[PDB]
Amino acid sequence: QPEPDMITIFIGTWNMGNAPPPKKITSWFLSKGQGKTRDDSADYIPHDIYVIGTQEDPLSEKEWLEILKHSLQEITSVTFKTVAIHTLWNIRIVVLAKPEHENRISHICTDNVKTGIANTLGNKGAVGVSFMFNGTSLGFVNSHLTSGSEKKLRRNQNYMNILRFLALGDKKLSPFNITHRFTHLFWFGDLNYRVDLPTWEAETIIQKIKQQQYADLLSHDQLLTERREQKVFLHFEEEEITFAPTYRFERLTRDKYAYTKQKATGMKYNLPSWCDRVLWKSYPLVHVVCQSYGSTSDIMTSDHSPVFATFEAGVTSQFVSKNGPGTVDSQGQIEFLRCYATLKTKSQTKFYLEFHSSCLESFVKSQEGENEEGSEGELVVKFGETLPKLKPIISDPEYLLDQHILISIKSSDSDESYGEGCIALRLEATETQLPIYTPLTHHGELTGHFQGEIKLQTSQ
Numbered sequence: 001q002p003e004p005d006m007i008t009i010f011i012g013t014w015n016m017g018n019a020p021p022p023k024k025i026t027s028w029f030l031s032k033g034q035g036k037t038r039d040d041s042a043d044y045i046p047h048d049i050y051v052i053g054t055q056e057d058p059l060s061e062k063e064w065l066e067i068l069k070h071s072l073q074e075i076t077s078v079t080f081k082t083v084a085i086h087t088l089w090n091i092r093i094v095v096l097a098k099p100e101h102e103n104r105i106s107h108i109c110t111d112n113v114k115t116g117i118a119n120t121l122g123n124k125g126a127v128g129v130s131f132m133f134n135g136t137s138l139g140f141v142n143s144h145l146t147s148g149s150e151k152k153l154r155r156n157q158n159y160m161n162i163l164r165f166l167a168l169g170d171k172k173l174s175p176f177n178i179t180h181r182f183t184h185l186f187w188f189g190d191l192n193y194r195v196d197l198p199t200w201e202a203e204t205i206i207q208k209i210k211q212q213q214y215a216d217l218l219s220h221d222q223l224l225t226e227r228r229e230q231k232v233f234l235h236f237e238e239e240e241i242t243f244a245p246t247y248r249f250e251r252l253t254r255d256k257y258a259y260t261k262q263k264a265t266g267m268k269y270n271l272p273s274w275c276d277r278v279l280w281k282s283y284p285l286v287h288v289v290c291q292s293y294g295s296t297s298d299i300m301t302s303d304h305s306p307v308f309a310t311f312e313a314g315v316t317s318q319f320v321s322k323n324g325p326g327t328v329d330s331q332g333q334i335e336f337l338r339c340y341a342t343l344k345t346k347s348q349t350k351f352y353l354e355f356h357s358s359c360l361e362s363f364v365k366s367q368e369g370e371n372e373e374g375s376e377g378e379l380v381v382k383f384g385e386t387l388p389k390l391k392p393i394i395s396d397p398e399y400l401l402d403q404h405i406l407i408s409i410k411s412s413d414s415d416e417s418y419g420e421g422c423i424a425l426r427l428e429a430t431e432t433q434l435p436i437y438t439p440l441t442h443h444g445e446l447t448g449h450f451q452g453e454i455k456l457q458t459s460q
């Protein structure tokens with residue numbers, strides 16, 4: 001039985017509105033309804049992994065697990081294995097996988113983050129799951145962010161708290177937050193970003209939705225506009241939205257948006273909005289293709305419609321050679337030429353680099369770089385030709401070209417990371433000087449750049 005080089009992953013997000021689901025929810029898992037939907041000819045083909053995010057979930061874990069497994073069994077005739085389930089208040093994540101994957105999946109981690117302080121601590125936050133699938137690290141975040149049209153800044157703050165404090169993936173990757181720890185990171189939930197149009201335009205918005213004319217609505221979607229101004233979800237992707245706003249519906253129909261202010265809403269309008277979203281971030285030059293992104297039309301127990309997204313994701317095998325793992329392979333090396341970091345920091349301390357990768361036996365610390373002034377104020381940290389020669393555990397190009405090097409630039413004074421980025425070894429050539437580049441971030445915000453040249457030697 002050969003190891004896969006591709007798997008398909010189903011991501012679902014549903015705010016259930018504290019109501020039990022209807023007896024049939026198979027349309028969700030089949031990516032049927034509005035938007036980018038899945039071909040009928042694929043209906044019996046199981047996804048490799050199903051990741052289900054719920055918000056305002058009134059069910060026990062046991063109750064929801066039985067509905068999800070019986071749903072997938074009716075679709076596929078496959079009895080899925082429970083990889084992980086984690087609940088914070090009414091925010092839940094379930095990960096199910098095909099039984100054939102049980103011994104491909106390891107290093108399962110779960111965590112949660114509670115967002116806000118006092119007033120604002122008690123029901124919003126995030127749950128997450130990570131694991132290895134063969135040689136590929138996968139992370140999944142289900143977040144329920146702050147509600148209300150006038151709280152997009154709060155949502156952006158909730159995002160930064162979640163990516164700073166959610167403890168998933170390889171704890172040895174100590175300078176790196178969840179936005180650098182995974183081959184593929186999927187972040188989804190009731191993110192609660194709204195279509196920011198005047199309240200007096202509610203009926204105009206509804207008109208536009210009935211005409212399936214989303215263009216003038218999406219131009220005011222707070223997640224797209226905040227992303228465009230680099231306020232949130234920097235270096236994440238989202239598929240184009242071609243489905244109607246998923247909030248706020250009258251229950252038991254999809255014929256009516258319930259937008260008017262009510263005691264029950266705290267006297268807030270809920271203009272139709274794309275609250276319910278799926279985004280991802282994969283390492284540079286790894287295959288990831290969105291194959292569906294849409295909403296169901298036939299699940300109406302909640303004031304939200306379920307959202308589905310499906311992805312092709314590149315995966316690698318658990319590589320064994322005669323040499324590594326458990327030693328180096330003298331035939332492999334990674335060299336760096338003409339390298340420099342450009343940092344936004346106003347501070348003047350010395351900096352060194354750390355290189356982290358599962359292709360190394362352990363992380364490597366460089367010598368301090370030489371600080372110079374950029375022509376536009378910037379701090380430029382020059383490494384020239386001084387960076388170490390990295391010794392990968394396996395030299396086979398079929399392994400080494402699929403790997404990545406995480407970089408942290410750390411202060412010599414404090415040993416705190418000022419920026420994190422990632423470099424793909426999927427080079428156009430080996431034994432050849434090639435440009436490399438990554439942006440650097442810290443707490444998910446842009447803090448600088450790293451650029452230079454790489455020279456990769458493999459056993460070929």
Ligand SMILES: C[C@H]1CN(S(C)(=O)=O)CC[C@H]1N
Nearest residue numbers: 224225226227228229236237
């Ligand atoms: C960075 C993405 C998404 N953005 S966006 C919606 O402005 O943030 C446009 C260009 C794309 N490469």
